[PDB]
Structures are given as structure tokens and as C-alpha cells.
Structure 1
């Protein structure tokens, strides 16, 4: 009945669909478990109708990002604003000291930069002589260059350098040192509606292809030459080619016990060892977001990029200055509970400077993400948890402590203080169809394995797409976008030529 069956309506699947149609292919489906398309691309609506991407937000690597370039071309022709370049000079804030960025005496940006070259040198042409954690790597550096670092640099640099946790959605003790640093192919463009991208692509093929709320439970590959696919409601579709775009975290269920897990797909035959071993190669991080909606901007718009540093100690400096080796240090750190807003770095996007909106989009990482998404409906607790970083920010930005206005209550002498009107939090680590943000690396991981395993397919019939099945743009919206065109063309020409 069906030529190709695309599982998942994220951008990978939506692209694969747009293409198949672009190549005259007919009778193809798109089975999406959620009741909406977009997958990890979702724009929501808050106070006074403001819109925010709770999922993906940027076009990364604008110098090579092909999806972005398509968008740029569209904007050249119709003048419609689709994105904005929000790269800015980062403001770094420490609870006690305050702003530690562009410091005439701390010069953290320079050492961080060195820190970066050091890491490159440690793994350059070595085959990864034992991979450690970003945390360990940072320690090695501090030890090896202390003779050339002041006290304040040994104390703060490691905290500032953790902003990289918000790029992987992983804390520095869980993240791989070998993958921490990666290529940044040019500036980033804040998408002004990734939902426009999702919207455009979904409307580039027969709407009657989309089947929302279709949980796919099992995929069968009868050597006969067809592929049996059964959604959850008991329906069944027969197809020649199948493009599975579910997320790595989800797919990683097909290789475990308990087939009653939400989303899990039963494969018949079972995924060859290559694929199943790929999963031991690690994956899935947990980048999260909290949107803070204020009545109006009443703070300085010096920068659109603000990062709060996790608390540090002079007791740390002393331990670096006295350790005699990695072992004595790796141990002398036996020094030392209660997670607070100052227990990890937090990345704040000041939307006022960049998009004229009085809100802040904050990014968070594991293990914090899952705990905060857990209390997403408890506005009061969320406000109490972040109130201190928020006020520290407002202070540093020539403003005042935040007033809680989420409950409809109007006052007048508060037109000079920032009034918080609402909080929106993501829910990716708890949504069964995502179970996390995107692929990431634990010390010892190796992405190539999975990319190859995935791009080589289960066979000539069962293929794969998604931010986890490609090398360029891995984990990014465009990476997923291209992986969708890939499998799509590999099946397309393989049909036009047929007959």
C-alpha cells in the first residue's frame, strides 16, 4: 500500500517527506506519536502573546549551515525577518564578586582561550591517550600552568569555562573531555520562529500524509520484500522502505527489557550488533530551558549574553598551589549538599537587547534540568529557587530586586522595579518521546560509531535519520534536516529509476 513510511514528524522526518514529494514519489506516510509536528522544535506562547522556542533556538555554523542558507535566501527575496544575529560579548557574574568579565586584572577570556589550546594539544594526534572528564582535564591544566596563573584565575577560570556545559547539556564531571571542544563554524543566528521553518517544510507535501498520535510499537522486515509497521491503535501499514527518525534515547529502548515502555519500538529482526554496540558508545544530554517573562524591560541592555558562575572557594586555590601531582590533587579534593541556583553555571539570554522582548531565556544542564522540569507547574518554588541569580543579574544591570507578579495583583510604585509576570519551563527529560535534549558524550564515548552504524542502516529497507545519524551538524537542527534529505534521496532516485 505504501512506498515509504517515515516514522517521526521532527525536522528530520519533515525534510525526508518534503523531499520524497519533491521527487514525485507517491503514497508515503508520516507517523508521529505526539499530537503536533516539530519534535524537539517547538515554539510556545506566553504573556502578552510573546513567543519562544522551548526546543531549538539557533542556526549554528551559519557559514556552512545549509538549512540556514536556504532561510537567508528566502529573506533576501521577501524581506521577511526569519532570524537575528545575537552573538554578543559575554557578561560573567559571580555571586560574591559580581561581574568578572573583561576584567583588567583577571583577564579570564585570555586564559580560557589558552585553556582551549591546551585541551586541543592534549588530544591532538594521540588517538585520545585516555579520555577523562572535562572537569579532570580542566584540573590538569590548572596544575600544569599554575606557575603562570594568579590566584583569582585559578579560582574563577574553571567556573567561567563551564559555560560549555550549556552546549552539551551536561555537567563537567559527566561530559567527555575529548568532545567538549568542537568547531564553531561562524556566528549563530537566533531563529525568530523555528516554527516557521517547521511550518514551511510541513506544508511542502500532501497534508494527508501526516498521522498524528501514532505510537509505532513494532517494525517488521519480512525478507519477502515488504515492511510491516503497526501503530499503537492496532492499525498496520505495509511499505518497501522505512525511515526511522525517533531520537537516540528512544531508539535505545529497542535493545533492552520491558517492551511496554512508552515509545519503544520492537524490531524484527533485532538490530545487528553494530547498532547495539553503538549505544554503549554513549549519548543523550539534557539541555533544559526556563523562560522568565517580565512586564517590561527595566534593566540595562548592555549584552544579550549573561552567564552566572557557580560558587568557588579560595580553599580551592590553596589546594592547587599545594598539590604535588594529579593523584595528590585528584585526592586532596576530598574536601567537603543542597543544590541551589549557585551550584552550577547558568546561561541567560537577555531577549530585550536581541528581540525587543522583556524576557530572559535561560539554559540549564544535567543533573539540574531533570529536577527543575520536575517542578515545572510549581511557579512559586521555581521563583524561590532562581530569585537569587535573578536579583544578582538585575543588580549588575543597574536595576533592582525582582517583584513576583505572576499572580494577578496590580501595584503602582513598582513601575521602576522588574515585575516577573510568568515562568515557562521545558519538559524534555520527562517527555517519553524525547527523554532528553540531544546526543552528547560521557568520558570514553565515541560518536563516529553511532553515526556510521546509523547511516549504514539496518539494511537497504530500514534506514535512519536524525541529529544522531550524521557527522556535520551532529545534534543540530540542520544536522537532522540533512540526514532527512540523505535517506530520502537514497530512496528517491532508487524509485524514479525503477519505473
Structure 2
């Protein structure tokens, strides 16, 4: 009855639909499990109506990003603002020492650059965790590092944890260091991107609250699709764009799992084997909304470093080898806001909004999202880093005003009015893990499809832009174009 059935209304599924329509293909459907489109692209509303992209927020690799270039062309043609280049000189804060960035003595950024080079050479032509790689660097280069560099550098370099959404002891060293193709551009409305694409094809194509539970290849070469609500569909081709984490459920037994799709026949071994990798990270976000800005806007990029110790330095100095270094690194807790690095975006400088957008990594992410409803507890957890940031930004301790009390004595003090938290690790339609946005087994299997009728798209199905919004976007255009060409050739 239908030419193509797209499962998932994320950017991958939406672009696919936009492409099909663009190429004159009719009678298509987009089945989405949620009651909204966008998927991992979701803009939420907070205090005084302020908006924030709780999912994707930046356009990466702007020198080659096709989606960004499309957005840029639009703004060049209508002068409307669709993004802002917010890269900045990072401000690094240690709880005890305060700012350690661009330090005339520490020169941490310079040694971090050496660390990245060290990583590049370590895996050159290679066919270890991030933590171990850093320890290797310190042992090898200690003769050329001051005491404070050995102490702070490892905590600074961990900003990469926020790129991968994963702790350094769990992140693989080989996939940690990589370069981005140009500046990043903060999207001033990824929802505006979702909207434009979503409205580029006929409305009746969209079917929300349609949780696909099964996909079958009929003997008549037709593909049947059934949603939880009982509805049944069939088409010439199907483009599956559900997240890798959801698709992974298909290999497990019991169709019970929310989101899990029953494949008949099952996904071929090439696909199944591909899941034996990835699915560990989890990027989370916490938005702190203040009444107004009363802090320095020197930079829109701030990172708080986890606590470090001088004993750590003594150990690195005394260790005779890696094994002895590990052994010595055994002291004698409870996780606090200073137990890991945290990345804060000072939206005041970049967008003029008196709010901070903070990124966190697994294992913290899961823990914080699990208490996302307990605002008082959230404030207590982050209060110490929030106050240190304010102190370093020429301001003062944050006033908890989530339960407001108009008081003129707060005039020039930061008053927190609301906290917003992501929920991706607890969302059954996203669940699984997170991967950084990069400019192989899974990519090959996915881009290869189940067969000539069952295709796949999404951020986990492409090389260029892997784990990126533009990658998912491009992967959608890819599958749609492949099918439109085929349909056009039929006659």
C-alpha cells in the first residue's frame, strides 16, 4: 500500500521523508513511538520561557557539515539568526587553586597539546583506557614536567570525558583523541531545524504514538510493520532509524522490552556481531537558570577540574614502572561534584541568557538523571562547584530561589530560579549509551542493510559524522536517495 515506511521521526527519519517527498515519491509513512518528532533533538522550555536544546546543541565540523552549511545558506538569504559561533578560550577551575587556565607557570594547555600528540603517535598504524594512556604519558615525560603539571594536567585533559560522555577509566584510549573539522556553532534552535525538515513533507505521512513492535519480510517481497496499538502496515521499502541501543534489544528474547522490534527473519549475524561493541557512555545535561547575570562574561566555556593531590605527584615521581604506578595508586569516599570534571556553558556571553548549560558523563549522568525530580538534592550536589565558578567570575555564592522570596538584598547576587535535567538514560526510546560526534563494523553492517528492502539510517549508520546530528541527517538522505532512484528506474 505504501512505497516506503520510515520508522522513527528523529532527524534521520525526518530527512529521509523530506528527501523522498523532494524526489516525488508518494504514499510513504513515518512511524514514531513518541508523541513528538525530533528524537534526540529536543528543545525544552524553562524559567520565563527560556528555551534549551536538552539533546543536541551544537553544529560540529562547520567546515564540512552539510546540515550546517544548509542552515548557513538560509541565514545568508534571509539574515535571520540560526546559530552562533561560541568557541572560546576555556576557563579551568580547581576547587583549591581557582583558575589554572592560560597560566604563565602551569602552561597546562601546552602540555595537553603534547598529550594529544603522544596519543596520536601511540596508536599510529595500530590495528588500554584513556586513564592508562595518561598515566603512560606522565611516566614517560615526568623528567620534562613540573610538579604542578603532573598534578593538574591529568585532570584538565579529562575534559574529553564530556566529549565522549564517559569516565576516563572506562573510555578506550584509541578512540579518545580526534580532531574536529573547524569551529562549532551553537544551534539557536535545533527545534527550528527539526520543524523545517518535518514540514518539508506531507503531514498525513506522520503517525505519532506508533511503537513499532515487529517488521517482517513477506514471501511476496513485501515488508509488514505492526505498531503496539494494533495497527498494521506494509510497503515496498522500510528505513529503520531507531537508536542503536533500541535496535540492540532485537537480539534479546521477549518482545516485552519497550521499543524492541521483532525481526522476522532475525537480523543476520553480521548485524548481531556488531553490537558486541559500543554502548557505554551517556552524556547528560543540567540547566541552571538564574534571575540575571551578575558574573563575568569573559568566556562562554568553563570546566571545573576534579580534585587532585600532591601525593599523586610524589607517586608519579617515585614509580619505577607502570605496574608499580598502578599498585601505588591505591589509597583509601562518596561521589561529589568535585569527583569528576564538569563542563559549563556560560550562555550569558554567547546568547545573552542568564543560564548555565552543564554537561556530565557516565557514571554520574545516570545517577543525576535518577534524581532529576529532587531539585533540592540537585542544588545541594552542585552548589559547591556553582559557588566556585561564581567566585572565579567576580561574583558570589549562589542564592537558592527555586522557591522564590522577593528580597532586594539579592540585587547583585546570583539567584538560582530553576534546574532542568536531561532524562536520556531513563528514556526507553533512547536508553542505551552515547557516543561522541566524530568527523566501523556497525557502520558497515548498517549501511549494508538487512536486505534490499530493509534499510537502516541514524547516527550509528554512517562514517562521516558518526554520532553526530549531521551524520544522522546525511544517513537519512542517503537511504531515501537510494530508494527514490530505484523507484524511478522501475519505470
Give the TM-score, by structure 1 length.
0.97
SS in 2 for 1:160: helix
RMSD: 1.3
Farther-moved stretch of structure 1 (432-441 vs 115-124): 432-441
Structure 2 residues without counterparts, runs of 5 or longer: none
1:260 to 237, 256, 263: 256
| Residue in structure 2 matched with residue 456 of structure 1 by the alignment | 448
Cα distance in 2 for partners of 1:48, 1:404 equals: 17
Cα distance in 2 for partners of 1:282, 1:481 equals: 21
Cα distance in 2 for partners of 1:226, 1:299 equals: 61
Do the aligned partners of 1:179 and 1:441 also contact (CA within 8 Å) in 2? no
Do the aligned partners of 1:288 and 1:426 also contact (CA within 8 Å) in 2? yes
SS in 2 for 1:143: helix
Cα distance in 2 for partners of 1:256, 1:208 equals: 34
Flag the 1:441–1:136 CA change in 2: closer, same or farther, 3 A.
farther
Flag the 1:412–1:441 CA change in 2: closer, same or farther, 3 A.
closer
Q: 1:416: how far off?
A: 1.0
User: What are the superposed Cα offsets for residues 257-280 of structure 1, whole Å, 9 maximum, x if unpaired?
Assistant: 232011001110111111111000
User: What are the superposed Cα offsets for residues 171-226 of structure 1, whole Å, 9 maximum, x if unpaired?
Assistant: 10111110101120000000000000000000000000000011010111123210
Q: 1:283: how far off?
A: 3.0
Q: 1:436: how far off?
A: 4.3
Cα distance in 2 for partners of 1:220, 1:314 equals: 61
| Residue in structure 1 matched with residue 470 of structure 2 by the alignment | 478
Do the aligned partners of 2:163 and 2:436 also contact (CA within 8 Å) in 1? no
Q: 1:126: how far off?
A: 2.8
SS in 2 for 1:420: strand
1:224 to 220, 224, 238: 220
Structure 1 residues without counterparts, runs of 5 or longer: none
Q: 1:440: how far off?
A: 5.7
Cα distance in 2 for partners of 1:38, 1:285 equals: 21
Q: 1:54: how far off?
A: 0.4
Cα distance in 1 for partners of 2:272, 2:126 equals: 27
Do the aligned partners of 1:283 and 1:441 also contact (CA within 8 Å) in 2? no
Cα distance in 2 for partners of 1:240, 1:392 equals: 59
Cα distance in 1 for partners of 2:100, 2:315 equals: 22
| Residue in structure 2 matched with residue 120 of structure 1 by the alignment | 120
Q: 1:496: how far off?
A: 1.1
SS in 2 for 1:190: strand
| Residue in structure 2 matched with residue 106 of structure 1 by the alignment | 106
User: What are the superposed Cα offsets for residues 381-411 of structure 1, whole Å, 9 maximum, x if unpaired?
Assistant: 0000000000000000000100001113211
Q: Write the mapping of 1:486-497 to structure 2, written as runs, cut at 5 A.
A: 486-497=478-489
Cα distance in 2 for partners of 1:284, 1:327 equals: 26
SS in 2 for 1:422: strand
SS in 2 for 1:300: coil
Cα distance in 2 for partners of 1:302, 1:439 equals: 30
Work out the number of aligned pairs and report it. Answer: 491
User: What are the superposed Cα offsets for residues 40-98 of structure 1, whole Å, 9 maximum, x if unpaired?
Assistant: 00001111111110000000000000000000000000000000000000000000100
SS in 1 for 2:180: coil
Flag the 1:384–1:251 CA change in 2: closer, same or farther, 3 A.
same
Do the aligned partners of 2:8 and 2:32 also contact (CA within 8 Å) in 1? yes
Cα distance in 2 for partners of 1:201, 1:146 equals: 53
Cα distance in 2 for partners of 1:427, 1:230 equals: 27
User: What are the superposed Cα offsets for residues 4-56 of structure 1, whole Å, 9 maximum, x if unpaired?
Assistant: 10000000000000000001101110011110000000001111111110000
Do the aligned partners of 1:248 and 1:284 also contact (CA within 8 Å) in 2? no
SS in 1 for 2:409: coil
Do the aligned partners of 1:283 and 1:440 also contact (CA within 8 Å) in 2? no
User: What are the superposed Cα offsets for residues 100-147 of structure 1, whole Å, 9 maximum, x if unpaired?
Assistant: 0000000000000000000000001132xxxx1001101000111001
Cα distance in 2 for partners of 1:441, 1:196 equals: 21
SS in 1 for 2:349: helix
Flag the 1:124–1:41 CA change in 2: closer, same or farther, 3 A.
same
Flag the 1:30–1:82 CA change in 2: closer, same or farther, 3 A.
same
Farther-moved stretch of structure 1 (277-286 vs 134-143): 277-286
Q: 1:438: how far off?
A: 2.9
Cα distance in 1 for partners of 2:243, 2:143 equals: 46
Cα distance in 2 for partners of 1:301, 1:126 equals: 43
Cα distance in 1 for partners of 2:450, 2:489 equals: 23
Q: 1:285: how far off?
A: 2.1
| Residue in structure 2 matched with residue 207 of structure 1 by the alignment | 203
Cα distance in 1 for partners of 2:280, 2:460 equals: 9
Do the aligned partners of 2:457 and 2:475 also contact (CA within 8 Å) in 1? yes
The answer as to 2:344 corresponding to 1:348 is yes
Do the aligned partners of 2:83 and 2:186 also contact (CA within 8 Å) in 1? yes
Do the aligned partners of 1:85 and 1:190 also contact (CA within 8 Å) in 2? yes
Cα distance in 2 for partners of 1:437, 1:136 equals: 22
Cα distance in 1 for partners of 2:305, 2:338 equals: 7
Farther-moved stretch of structure 1 (67-76 vs 175-184): 175-184
SS in 2 for 1:252: helix
Cα distance in 1 for partners of 2:264, 2:437 equals: 29
Cα distance in 1 for partners of 2:253, 2:97 equals: 51
